Amino acid sequence: APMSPSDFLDKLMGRTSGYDARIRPNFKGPPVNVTCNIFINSFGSIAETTMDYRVNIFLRQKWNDPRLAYSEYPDDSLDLDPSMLDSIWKPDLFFANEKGANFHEVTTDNKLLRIFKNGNVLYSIRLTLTLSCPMDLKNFPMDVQTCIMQLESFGYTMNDLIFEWQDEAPVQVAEGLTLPQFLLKEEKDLRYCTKHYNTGKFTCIEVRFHLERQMGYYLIQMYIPSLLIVILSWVSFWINMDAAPARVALGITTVLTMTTQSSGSRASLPKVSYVKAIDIWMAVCLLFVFSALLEYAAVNFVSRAGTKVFIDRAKKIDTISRACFPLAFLIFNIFYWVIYKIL
Amino acid sequence: MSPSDFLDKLMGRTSGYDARIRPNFKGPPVNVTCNIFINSFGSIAETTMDYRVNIFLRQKWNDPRLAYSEYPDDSLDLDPSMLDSIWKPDLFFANEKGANFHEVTTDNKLLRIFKNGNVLYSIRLTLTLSCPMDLKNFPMDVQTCIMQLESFGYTMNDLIFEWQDEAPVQVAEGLTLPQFLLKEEKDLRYCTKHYNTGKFTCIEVRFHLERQMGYYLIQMYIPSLLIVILSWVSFWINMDAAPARVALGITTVLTMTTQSSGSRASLPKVSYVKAIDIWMAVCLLFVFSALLEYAAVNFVSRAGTKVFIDRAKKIDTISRACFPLAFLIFNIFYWVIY
Amino acid sequence: MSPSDFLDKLMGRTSGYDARIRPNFKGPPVNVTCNIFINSFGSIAETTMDYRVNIFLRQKWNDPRLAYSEYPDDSLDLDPSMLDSIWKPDLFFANEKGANFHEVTTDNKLLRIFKNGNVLYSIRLTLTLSCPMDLKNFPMDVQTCIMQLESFGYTMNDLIFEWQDEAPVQVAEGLTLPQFLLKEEKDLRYCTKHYNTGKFTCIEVRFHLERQMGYYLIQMYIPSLLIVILSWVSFWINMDAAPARVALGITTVLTMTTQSSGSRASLPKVSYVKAIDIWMAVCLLFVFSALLEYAAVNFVSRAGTKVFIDRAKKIDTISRACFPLAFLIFNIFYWVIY
Amino acid sequence: SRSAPMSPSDFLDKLMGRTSGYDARIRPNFKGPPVNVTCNIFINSFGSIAETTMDYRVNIFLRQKWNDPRLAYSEYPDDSLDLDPSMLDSIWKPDLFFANEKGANFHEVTTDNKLLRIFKNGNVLYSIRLTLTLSCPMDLKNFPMDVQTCIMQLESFGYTMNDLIFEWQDEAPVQVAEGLTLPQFLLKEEKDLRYCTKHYNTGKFTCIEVRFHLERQMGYYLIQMYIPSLLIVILSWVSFWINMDAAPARVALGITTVLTMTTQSSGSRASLPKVSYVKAIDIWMAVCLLFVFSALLEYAAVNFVSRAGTKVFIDRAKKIDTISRACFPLAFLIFNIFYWVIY
Amino acid sequence: MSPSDFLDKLMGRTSGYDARIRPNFKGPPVNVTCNIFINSFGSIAETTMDYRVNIFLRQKWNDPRLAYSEYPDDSLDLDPSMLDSIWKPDLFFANEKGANFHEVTTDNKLLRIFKNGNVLYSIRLTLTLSCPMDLKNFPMDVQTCIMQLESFGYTMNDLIFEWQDEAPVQVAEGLTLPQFLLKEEKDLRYCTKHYNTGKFTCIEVRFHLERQMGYYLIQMYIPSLLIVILSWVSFWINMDAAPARVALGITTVLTMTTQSSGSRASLPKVSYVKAIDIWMAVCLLFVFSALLEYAAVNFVSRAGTKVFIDRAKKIDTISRACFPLAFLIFNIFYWVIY
Ligand SMILES: CC[C@H](C)[C@H]1O[C@]2(CC[C@@H]1C)C[C@@H]1C[C@@H](C/C=C(\C)[C@@H](O[C@H]3C[C@H](OC)[C@@H](O[C@H]4C[C@H](OC)[C@@H](O)[C@H](C)O4)[C@H](C)O3)[C@@H](C)/C=C/C=C3\CO[C@@H]4[C@H](O)C(C)=C[C@@H](C(=O)O1)[C@]34O)O2
Numbered sequence A: 001a002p003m004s005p006s007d008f009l010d011k012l013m014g015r016t017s018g019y020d021a022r023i024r025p026n027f028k029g030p031p032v033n034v035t036c037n038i039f040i041n042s043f044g045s046i047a048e049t050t051m052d053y054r055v056n057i058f059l060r061q062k063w064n065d066p067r068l069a070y071s072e073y074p075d076d077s078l079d080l081d082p083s084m085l086d087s088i089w090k091p092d093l094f095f096a097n098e099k100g101a102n103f104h105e106v107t108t109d110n111k112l113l114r115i116f117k118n119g120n121v122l123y124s125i126r127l128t129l130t131l132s133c134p135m136d137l138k139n140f141p142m143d144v145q146t147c148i149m150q151l152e153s154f155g156y157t158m159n160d161l162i163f164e165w166q167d168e169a170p171v172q173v174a175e176g177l178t179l180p181q182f183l184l185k186e187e188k189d190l191r192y193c194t195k196h197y198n199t200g201k202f203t204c205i206e207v208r209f210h211l212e213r214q215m216g217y218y219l220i221q222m223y224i225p226s227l228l229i230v231i232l233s234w235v236s237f238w239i240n241m242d243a244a245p246a247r248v249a250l251g252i253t254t255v256l257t258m259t260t261q262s263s264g265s266r267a268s269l270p271k272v273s274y275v276k277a278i279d280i281w282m283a284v285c286l287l288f289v290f291s292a293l294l295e296y297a298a299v300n301f302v303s304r305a306g307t308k309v310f311i312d313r314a315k316k317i318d319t320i321s322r323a324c325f326p327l328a329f330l331i332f333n334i335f336y337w338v339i340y341k342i343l
Numbered sequence B, C, E: 001m002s003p004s005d006f007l008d009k010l011m012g013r014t015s016g017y018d019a020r021i022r023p024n025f026k027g028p029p030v031n032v033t034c035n036i037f038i039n040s041f042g043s044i045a046e047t048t049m050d051y052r053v054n055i056f057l058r059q060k061w062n063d064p065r066l067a068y069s070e071y072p073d074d075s076l077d078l079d080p081s082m083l084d085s086i087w088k089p090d091l092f093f094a095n096e097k098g099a100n101f102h103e104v105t106t107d108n109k110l111l112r113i114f115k116n117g118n119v120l121y122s123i124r125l126t127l128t129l130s131c132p133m134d135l136k137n138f139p140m141d142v143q144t145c146i147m148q149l150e151s152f153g154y155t156m157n158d159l160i161f162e163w164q165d166e167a168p169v170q171v172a173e174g175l176t177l178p179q180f181l182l183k184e185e186k187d188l189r190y191c192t193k194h195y196n197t198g199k200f201t202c203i204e205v206r207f208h209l210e211r212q213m214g215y216y217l218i219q220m221y222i223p224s225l226l227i228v229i230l231s232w233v234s235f236w237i238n239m240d241a242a243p244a245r246v247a248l249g250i251t252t253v254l255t256m257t258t259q260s261s262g263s264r265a266s267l268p269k270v271s272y273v274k275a276i277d278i279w280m281a282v283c284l285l286f287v288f289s290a291l292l293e294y295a296a297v298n299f300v301s302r303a304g305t306k307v308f309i310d311r312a313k314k315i316d317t318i319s320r321a322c323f324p325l326a327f328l329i330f331n332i333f334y335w336v337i338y
Numbered sequence D: 001s002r003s004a005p006m007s008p009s010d011f012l013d014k015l016m017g018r019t020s021g022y023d024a025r026i027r028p029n030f031k032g033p034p035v036n037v038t039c040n041i042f043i044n045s046f047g048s049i050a051e052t053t054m055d056y057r058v059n060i061f062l063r064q065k066w067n068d069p070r071l072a073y074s075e076y077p078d079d080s081l082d083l084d085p086s087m088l089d090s091i092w093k094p095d096l097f098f099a100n101e102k103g104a105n106f107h108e109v110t111t112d113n114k115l116l117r118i119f120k121n122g123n124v125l126y127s128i129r130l131t132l133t134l135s136c137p138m139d140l141k142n143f144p145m146d147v148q149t150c151i152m153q154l155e156s157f158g159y160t161m162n163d164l165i166f167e168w169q170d171e172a173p174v175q176v177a178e179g180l181t182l183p184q185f186l187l188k189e190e191k192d193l194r195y196c197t198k199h200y201n202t203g204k205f206t207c208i209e210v211r212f213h214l215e216r217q218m219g220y221y222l223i224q225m226y227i228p229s230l231l232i233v234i235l236s237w238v239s240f241w242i243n244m245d246a247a248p249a250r251v252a253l254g255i256t257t258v259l260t261m262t263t264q265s266s267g268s269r270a271s272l273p274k275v276s277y278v279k280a281i282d283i284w285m286a287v288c289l290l291f292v293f294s295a296l297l298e299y300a301a302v303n304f305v306s307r308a309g310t311k312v313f314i315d316r317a318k319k320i321d322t323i324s325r326a327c328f329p330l331a332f333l334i335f336n337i338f339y340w341v342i343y
């Protein structure tokens, strides 16, 4: 008859085992090789203001512990109760760019422990992580962001512990996982982030996600409504020059609506000190609207004396402006959209 | 037999019971029958794309090691501290963003065992669950929010989940949602997962949430009508009054833009066209056209000759009937489509 | 007898006491008498539809195993660490959204035992309780917020809750709420629950919260009067001044819409008509009619003939008396109804 | 013959450990008079004073002193001994809680922020660092020239007055960190001390109280509230120097000042709780609104009496502006004299 | 010697080691040498007057009880669970508002011991530290944020802190702050505390944060210029156009007030004059004077006599050159001062 599980666990890692979790596998020999892979269950809360993003993952860690090799059962592997994780050695993996992180204990510890005949261990744990993602917003809202995730050892130096991504499918994403503001690109870069502190040299592996911001929201809520205000400023040119309060009021309100439009769009962003692509658009839209008001300043000023010579001279400005600003604004959009579509 | 001695022999020191070993450990998978009582349902957020729920999660399964003959009682209600001593499933919620137990004034847990070794295990949980939303038809949209009950560590050969046949999901009497109607029919299905670590049991319940329309009539649709109707009073005003007709034309356009942008403030920044965007867009055309109407009236009437003053006067008389007509025709189409 | 030896024999190692067994375990249900002291009452949120409270929860019951004769004292005040050694009820709050104990500087708990085995158990708790609100009469509404004390694991045959006869709910002296008046009368009743797991004891207290009106007079009703009264000054202005009368008519309409929408910002998005919606709607009619009044005046006076200029002049003289009259008549109705 | 003094390990074991027979569940002088606990606090930080939630936050060192005869020692000549704070679990100590506490926490980084010192005669000094959010009911009648009294109640939860009594130190019970400033308030030097002895249906419990006096700084409200209101009132007066024929200009100027004043008034109430009594800022805004609203009614009169273009009425209307030009600046100055003198 | 046996003899059961006793307990104070690695630096809030940091805190000291000769290794890297078995300093952060350890996936701690008994102890911490700010020169202000490392329980005769001589504070490569520049030079000093409980070791590091100006040029200073320049176009407009010049004068004043008040929204309510208040105040004078300029032009030109119409015309011609000049002179002064 085969050995009872209770007796087996006691002899392998319990009281009678002589197993010490404070000693690493191959303790006098070469470093432990931990093979990592992650399953991304959820990806979101991508905040420009706080410059971070949230992720829910299953972190898988694989390594060999010869002390856990067994011959008592024919099974290729054994699925163990996760309470046995406290009894075995395991890597001290932490996330270097983590701002917040927690385990999941409902309804029980969200953990998995599997051991193989030859002493291989599979250790999966569910984690929620808030990771820092420094952003370059120069091309906002046509920007593309690279958010990273660093898996590092806190206490073991490179001679004792080394991390490594799986060869096949290191990062997996849940089927049908969508982000409302971004597109998560299929290609994820993998690299080493090996750290050198004054305490020594520590293993660190990295994955980089590429996030492309979706443009459609900004067309509807930012670019189209700015067009509306610029087009509105042009109706001044089809209005009678004698109607001063109407043309001025129409010129002012477009300028002020454009400033609140511009400042309101910057409300959901961090206070960076470089020029963004949306700042260029709003600046130029503000010129075209501001020029339409200066256009009437000229029309009102040259037409002071009611002599036909000046009334017609002022009339000439409106006829030119009626064609030139719509032309000049179209020329600007050609340049603008080509620059941020080509580059 | 004294309860103290009984508990010791069944699951305590003298029992030889090992909670690290599942029931029927060398045999077929443990069949866990689940049912939930929804105590509270709310915090349905479009922005963060999730909802909050307070539930009693009931789990039923058979553990032959816990069968008893010492008492005639069909079942025994045990102190929940004994839950630490017995095996139980590792149920987690796959789409959970936040979750907690309830420990006031004591652990909000229930443990009941039956003669034949059946276990009833109820626990009170608060869960924040993710609910991806399709807002194409907002605010006449209907949302499907799910809840996945999954095993983290046991594969399908060791552990299987299953909904109760009779009344798997129960809702507290008189439970109302201020923004939504929770439909009576809940879909039940399997979400069985296949990871690189293996095949894991997963069962799913889908709630159907129908957004209540009344709020948006009062705070969104009626006040937009008011601005469109306001733009039409321009057509009954004297054409000579340029500042009045222009100012009235502008303010309606700007009030309409702030109205439109303000309605999008409580929503996530999605990149598709919503039903409210169509309404505001068209309302903006009718108000913007009313201003362009005066641009025409002011332009054709430049020279004070009677021929043009009457020609300009003709535009207002047509516009007075045509925009109210055209706007009514639009509402017929709009409300019929959705 | 030394206290150390006494505690050891009553509930410790040598006692044979088992906290997993209830008092009168083979007999009738344990009668727990509850009373609460409300230390703090506030954070009453309409949006999230809940309120926060800080209380001392007192529980009284008899455990014959804790009867003593070793000391003449009527009762003994025990160190609260002994609460872990005795049986106690599993009271939870059914409508609790959040709850916590208080551990600074030590556990905020009290344990007192009496000669005959009676136990007094007081614990300080902060609770966030759900309070579904009816805002039909807002801001002249009155709200009923409840608090349910329930057993999670014991059925009615094993455990029954009951309010004290004398002063079950006590309130700290000078406790005031800035937005509400907490009425002196609190309703007490049974909320006995029937789940598929059985029948569970539940007792309930209902607080009546009357919203204070003064804030809304100053920040909502008076400023709306100001805008309505402002619209009437148009009628004392020259009819030739089109831009002035129109601009004055528009700005009052738009100020009234932002006034109306801004007042709904601190409320949940409910789909029924509130009393404040009626007021703002009617105020909007009187302001909107004042603008339509000038549309008529400007339209009938097109040709500068004396017959129409006087006919248009007649409208203003009637309107000067009729709208102030009609608005006063509306307030008579409105304030009398609510 | 001078033998070696007792080892600390053995000493702690005999005083409060295994061999001691010490029971932390029994109070000092258990069959005798009440334990006299002498309290004092050091205020490390004082802030987050919120009108809306009606509370304030404080970081303190809470010192408690009392005598436990069981902890008297003669084995060392030292007047006192500084003990590892893990020994706090082994001794009896008071059950002090803060009666008006809405939130409270200990500090465990990098170790427990606690101090335990014992004296030859059995006196104990126990200091613990706490962050507390305390409720402070506010009277805003005189806001923003209001003065607030925020209290802090130290109470026993489980011990009645016959077993436990609290008492402030005679010398310097409340100490404040040097250079501690509050941006919105001035913390007055004088702190009131008194008894808050509680009588519940569970009995009579010791309670001692400290009252802080917080005087709100006026400078912020001059710059952001009072001066900008003056600007709008002064702006309304420029109407009186404008031509009476210019109806749209005088009306538009009259309206915009009224509406700017309402948004000014409602915006100032945004950071306050929704109280149902009249505040001092409500009086100011109300009167400022009268002066601006009267300036518009002034033109209603000017426009109405001057209907027919006859010289008699045009001059009669002209007389109103000349009186108003001097009377409103006078009347507004008279109001400020009254207003600022009252508060 | 096996590691298990070695740890048992050095600090475990057979060791006789007592973590409640400090190294050199009857002798001179323990000298703890501190150094920090700044992994992250941010959340610098003016409103709450604090900042957040993520660090590795390194502590070095000698414990002769931990000296070893059993292995030739210069040092040994120990499992961090052994930290509970050894004595270590009670370092706390005096100006800490919030602080936490990091336990994912295991305790983020490092323990290394040397032959001679030296200990290296590194722990990862997130800290929210208070940073009182002087905003007199905002937004051209420079801030000094400090970090105090103090002993809570040990007086100066038992425990002394000290910064490392070489590289006490290290910063992660490529660490940038979006609003500030973290200066390379960090001041180090002693903050030794004297309470009524005694004299306690305290060492301090001061970071110098220079606020980046570019954001405020784009979102604050340039848009204010735009409104001031807009006010000047009034001077090229016909004096007969009263509603146009007044409306243009008003809207610039009101846009400037909302501009000014909106810039103060992200700041604490301090009662001293800031540099941005001076700028907005002066910008408000130039815009307010442009409106008073027309009050003069409209008033002196009452009677249509050529003498006054030209006299009023003279004011505009002077104002057209003088305000652009005077505003340029102001900017020369302003930007040179700060
Ligand atoms: C000269 C200003 C007057 C008032 C003109 O303003 C207007 C029209 C009327 C006037 C003629 C409108 C104005 C923009 C200007 C034109 C300006 C630009 C096209 C850009 O800026 C210029 C000058 C600027 O150096 C001050 C310079 O950046 C420097 C410093 C930078 O460090 C961060 C550095 O990276 C760089 C290398 O070098 C830049 C390259 O080039 C453009 C960047 C300005 C955008 C401004 C805005 C966008 O939204 C802002 C806000 O939400 C609002 C309410 C109004 C906008 C506005 O006010 O827009 C706003 O502030 O035209």
Ligand SMILES: CC[C@H](C)[C@H]1O[C@]2(CC[C@@H]1C)C[C@@H]1C[C@@H](C/C=C(\C)[C@@H](O[C@H]3C[C@H](OC)[C@@H](O[C@H]4C[C@H](OC)[C@@H](O)[C@H](C)O4)[C@H](C)O3)[C@@H](C)/C=C/C=C3\CO[C@@H]4[C@H](O)C(C)=C[C@@H](C(=O)O1)[C@]34O)O2
Binding pocket: B213, B214, B217, B218, B219, B220, B222, B223, B225, B226, B229, C257, C258, C260, C261, C262, C264, C271, C272, C273, C277, C278, C280, C281, C282, C284, C285, C288
């Ligand atoms: C008809 C609208 C035109 C544009 C008129 O608008 C104005 C004046 C000009 C036009 C003549 C102004 C308008 C109110 C209307 C008159 C309307 C009422 C007195 C009330 O509503 C009516 C119709 C309503 O049914 C559409 C009906 O509800 C029932 C049936 C519904 O099912 C069909 C059902 O769901 C619901 C639960 O029970 C009701 C009993 O009775 C009143 C309730 C409307 C209030 C509206 C408002 C209050 O604040 C809102 C907002 O903050 C804002 C910015 C402006 C307001 C406004 O716009 O106020 C506002 O939106 O007059």
Ligand SMILES: CC[C@H](C)[C@H]1O[C@]2(CC[C@@H]1C)C[C@@H]1C[C@@H](C/C=C(\C)[C@@H](O[C@H]3C[C@H](OC)[C@@H](O[C@H]4C[C@H](OC)[C@@H](O)[C@H](C)O4)[C@H](C)O3)[C@@H](C)/C=C/C=C3\CO[C@@H]4[C@H](O)C(C)=C[C@@H](C(=O)O1)[C@]34O)O2
Binding pocket: D219, D222, D223, D224, D225, D227, D228, D230, D231, D234, E257, E258, E260, E261, E262, E264, E271, E272, E273, E277, E278, E280, E281, E282, E284, E285, E288
């Ligand atoms: C007299 C005001 C009239 C209405 C003038 O207002 C205007 C133009 C029109 C009028 C002529 C506009 C006004 C500024 C003033 C001129 C004022 C200054 C240049 C400064 O202030 C003066 C007086 C001030 O003492 C009241 C004094 O502070 C000292 C002494 C105080 O002890 C008496 C003491 O407590 C204090 C701590 O230190 C100071 C040194 O000097 C300047 C500081 C004022 C700035 C004001 C503002 C900036 O943004 C604010 C707000 O976001 C807004 C909406 C409008 C602004 C405004 O309203 O700006 C605003 O409120 O001109």
Ligand SMILES: C[C@H]1[C@H]2C(=O)N(C)c3ccncc3[C@H]2CN1S(=O)(=O)c1ccc2c(c1)OCO2
Binding pocket: A022, A023, A024, A025, A027, A155, A156, A157, A160, E002, E003, E004, E006, E007, E071, E073, E076, E077, E078, E079, E080, E111
């Ligand atoms: C065996 C451990 C550790 C130890 O406790 N001792 C006594 C020795 C003895 C001889 N040589 C090395 C050690 C150290 C290192 N090994 S270990 O490689 O298994 C180990 C164990 C735990 C660790 C660690 C390294 O880095 C930080 O956490």
Ligand SMILES: C[C@H]1[C@H]2C(=O)N(C)c3ccncc3[C@H]2CN1S(=O)(=O)c1ccc2c(c1)OCO2
Binding pocket: A004, A005, A006, A008, A009, A073, A075, A078, A079, A080, A081, A082, B020, B021, B022, B023, B025, B153, B154, B155, B158
């Ligand atoms: C008996 C357990 C587990 C174990 O510890 N041992 C020693 C053996 C021995 C032989 N065959 C299988 C095992 C595994 C599996 N069984 S179990 O089915 O009861 C079990 C128990 C706990 C588990 C688990 C599976 O997966 C998740 O956590």
Ligand SMILES: C[C@H]1[C@H]2C(=O)N(C)c3ccncc3[C@H]2CN1S(=O)(=O)c1ccc2c(c1)OCO2
Binding pocket: B002, B003, B004, B006, B007, B071, B073, B076, B077, B078, B079, B080, C020, C021, C022, C023, C025, C153, C154, C155, C158
């Ligand atoms: C004695 C307990 C409980 C138990 O553990 N056993 C062994 C028996 C034995 C015989 N009859 C009943 C029991 C049950 C019931 N009793 S109890 O009434 O004291 C009890 C104890 C704990 C409970 C509970 C009821 O409801 C839920 O939590």
Ligand SMILES: C[C@H]1[C@H]2C(=O)N(C)c3ccncc3[C@H]2CN1S(=O)(=O)c1ccc2c(c1)OCO2
Binding pocket: C002, C003, C004, C006, C007, C071, C073, C076, C077, C078, C079, C080, D025, D026, D027, D028, D030, D158, D159, D160, D163
């Ligand atoms: C000695 C304790 C407590 C106790 O456990 N016993 C057995 C007795 C015996 C005789 N008289 C009184 C007691 C009580 C009271 N004393 S005590 O004064 O030290 C005490 C100890 C702990 C307490 C308490 C009072 O009230 C709050 O919690």
Ligand SMILES: C[C@H]1[C@H]2C(=O)N(C)c3ccncc3[C@H]2CN1S(=O)(=O)c1ccc2c(c1)OCO2
Binding pocket: D007, D008, D011, D012, D076, D078, D081, D082, D083, D084, D085, E020, E021, E022, E023, E025, E153, E154, E155, E158
């Ligand atoms: C040895 C400890 C402590 C102690 O427990 N005893 C018995 C004595 C005996 C004689 N002299 C001093 C003591 C005190 C002080 N020492 S200690 O320096 O190692 C120490 C240990 C722990 C401490 C502490 C001081 O202050 C803060 O917490």
Ligand SMILES: *[C@@H]1O[C@H](CO)[C@@H](O)[C@H](O)[C@H]1NC(C)=O
Binding pocket: E031, E033, E160, E162
């Ligand atoms: C602590 O050690 C440093 C060198 O590591 C030394 O310079 C300093 O003097 C020591 N401090 C004391 C108080 O002895």
Ligand SMILES: [Cl-]
Binding pocket: A249, B247, D252, E247
């Ligand atoms: Cl206007």
Ligand SMILES: [Zn+2]
Binding pocket: A187, A188, A189, A210
């Ligand atoms: Zn790539």
Ligand SMILES: [Zn+2]
Binding pocket: B185, B186, B187, B208
């Ligand atoms: Zn369905």
Ligand SMILES: [Zn+2]
Binding pocket: C185, C186, C187, C208
């Ligand atoms: Zn009642």
Ligand SMILES: [Zn+2]
Binding pocket: D190, D191, D192, D213
């Ligand atoms: Zn005082």
Ligand SMILES: [Zn+2]
Binding pocket: E185, E187, E208
């Ligand atoms: Zn320096």
